[PDB]
Design a protein around this ligand. Sequence first.
Ligand SMILES: Cc1cn([C@H]2C[C@H](OP(=O)(O)O)[C@@H](COP(=O)(O)O)O2)c(=O)[nH]c1=O
Ligand SMILES: [Ca+2]
Length: 129
Amino acid sequence: LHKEPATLIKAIDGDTVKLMYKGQPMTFRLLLVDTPEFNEKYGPEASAFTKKMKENAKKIEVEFDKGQRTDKYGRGLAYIYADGKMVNEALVRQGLAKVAYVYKGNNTHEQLLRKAEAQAKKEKLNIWS
Ligand SMILES: Cc1cn([C@H]2C[C@H](OP(=O)(O)O)[C@@H](COP(=O)(O)O)O2)c(=O)[nH]c1=O
Ligand SMILES: [Ca+2]
């Protein structure tokens, strides 16, 4: 897997974001996670966590996995990093997302994330409280 540059266009919610990638605007959906919807419990907290993490980053990177890079809605599917720190993992580690949508061949960081979720749940963080 390889990290590639991108720039924030606009935060959207917990697990989607509008980025410019290879010079083109594109909505990205974070791999391997599910945050609550904005109108659901912890949904505004997820949105807020992702917004700050990206808006504060001096450097955003996109990391595609081995399989599908685009979902059926045209959303880019990637691991997203903010100053070298993975947003997907950080959401899970804070109990602001569940590990989810783990499809064969786009699952490189599954075990890293499941270990974050385990710790989140142990600490009864947020969704696990
Ligand atoms: C995260 C992810 C979602 N999607 C699809 C599955 C779900 O389809 P349906 O819309 O038919 O339920 C939807 C979940 O996205 P959201 O969690 O953003 O709704 O996106 C993928 O196809 N691949 C993925 O890696
Ligand atoms: Ca969601």
